[PDB]
Write a protein that binds this ligand. Structure first.
Ligand code: HEM
Ligand SMILES: COc1ccc(C(=O)O)cc1O
Length: 393
């Protein structure tokens, strides 16, 4: 009743070009079985959205990677938010929601925008730059570690630690094995910066620790919640900004529309998140037998959600494979959906918006002028190198 496929969604060939295989996964049926890894898969928008929005049946506390924490030991102490279910999820979620709240965004927006304008000014003096290292990486690194309250020393561990986290959600392939082999210095830095004395006053980390006296989290929970922001607070933003620049370089007509109305900047970034979904996949684990898309799935089964595929499902999107900066993007699942929907989405959108706004106002053309290189990760989609020439407006 359920089609069995041999597609490996964590193979380098898949990463290099996932879109044909994602169509094969969608068109095979609403629920597939992936024989390579012994997991169920859902690749259409409808089932991915349904799974995300049923946390009782499709839980997160047994891991949102391949590994089932009821069977294997987690590679690090589980996240108190990403790998918790309601009700244990609820109060830590509330703390991060308030720390990264609409009101917090007002306190950081002027500085984030000035830093974006300054970065584009700097890059326009160089002309030919690497839009990953020099822009997608450099700009979030210039604003987010400071907003966290991190010291200057050791920041080189942040992106390697995040890549390790992304690879560790995957199956036990070479990407995951090698990440864990190299992990010790990055984990040691990150865990140490989570302690209250190492977080500068007024930043995100200090604000998490300040919430330890409301009854929502205890002092011993705050280091792990800081760890969540050091895990997730950079690499997907890097990849999303790089994807947006890639899209503007590939679809010059959309750069021209963006230049003509810079207030499209926020939606241009949101469309880039839909189009080149920085988080491609997450897992859930069934807590009971469940019927999903006409399929019966037993208890204790891993279900792989293809978020990038759901964001390109023609059953939900018109011309899904077009980058359209005026698309109604509401409802895409690049940030998830439901109770775990990205608690840092306002930070990511702020960074993406103000960077795309600075490009819209300052740059006339973005031309790829070198070999584009892909960055491979079991969970993240993004580029390693994006050589571009920036022409000033
Ligand atoms: C474009 C950038 C980003 C993308 C594409 C993204 C993607 C996602 C997705 C898909 C989830 C859902 C996980 C699930 O359902 O299991 C999520 C959750 C989360 N994200 Fe983001 N994220 C981004 C930026 C950020 C930033 C900037 C931060 C921190 C400042 C952050 C922190 C978190 C946390 C803590 C969670 C867990 C929330 C929960 O479990 O309730 N993310 N993200
Ligand atoms: C969506 O990506 C993530 C979200 C949350 C965490 C966490 O450690 O809580 C880690 C991640 O890699």
């Amino acid at each position: 009743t359920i089609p069995h496929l041999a597609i490996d969604p964590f193979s380098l060939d898949f990463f290099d070009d996932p879109y044909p295989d994602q169509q094969t996964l969608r068109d095979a049926g609403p629920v597939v079985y992936l024989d390579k890894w012994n997991v169920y898969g859902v690749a259409r928008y409808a089932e991915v959205h349904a799974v995300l929005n049923d946390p009782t049946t499709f839980c997160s506390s047994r891991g949102v990677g391949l590994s089932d924490f009821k069977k294997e030991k987690p590679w690090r102490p589980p996240s108190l938010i990403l790998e918790a279910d309601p009700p244990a999820h609820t109060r830590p979620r509330a703390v991060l929601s308030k720390v990264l709240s609409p009101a917090t965004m007002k306190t950081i927006r002027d500085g984030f925008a000035a830093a974006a304008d300054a970065k584009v000014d700097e890059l326009l003096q160089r002309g030919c730059i690497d839009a990953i290292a020099d822009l997608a990486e450099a700009y979030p690194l210039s604003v987010f570690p400071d907003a966290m309250g991190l010291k200057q020393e050791g920041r080189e561990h942040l992106l390697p630690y995040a890549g390790l986290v992304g690879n560790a959600f995957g199956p036990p392939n070479e990407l995951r094995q090698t990440a864990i082999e190299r992990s010790a210095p990055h984990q040691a830095y990150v865990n140490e910066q989570c302690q209250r004395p190492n977080l500068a006053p007024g930043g995100f980390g200090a604000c998490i620790h300040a919430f330890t006296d409301t009854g929502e989290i205890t002092p011993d929970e705050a280091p792990l919640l800081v760890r969540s922001l050091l895990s997730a607070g950079l690499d997907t933003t890097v990849n999303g900004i790089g994807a947006a620049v890639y899209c503007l370089a590939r679809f010059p007509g959309e750069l021209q529309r963006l230049r003509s109305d810079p207030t499209l900047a926020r939606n241009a970034f949101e469309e880039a998140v839909r189009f080149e979904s920085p988080v491609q996949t997450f897992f859930r684990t069934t807590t009971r037998e469940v019927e999903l898309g006409g399929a019966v799935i037993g208890e204790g089964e891993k279900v792989l959600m293809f978020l990038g595929s759901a964001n390109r499902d023609p059953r939900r999107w018109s011309d899904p494979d077009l980058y359209d900066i005026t698309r109604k993007t509401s409802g895409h699942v690049g940030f998830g959906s439901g109770v775990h929907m990205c608690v840092g989405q306002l930070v990511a959108r702020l960074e993406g918006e103000v960077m795309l706004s600075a490009l819209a106002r300052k740059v006339a053309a973005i031309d790829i002028d070198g070999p584009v290189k892909r960055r491979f990760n079991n969970t993240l989609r993004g580029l390693e190198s994006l050589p571009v020439k920036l022409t000033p407006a």
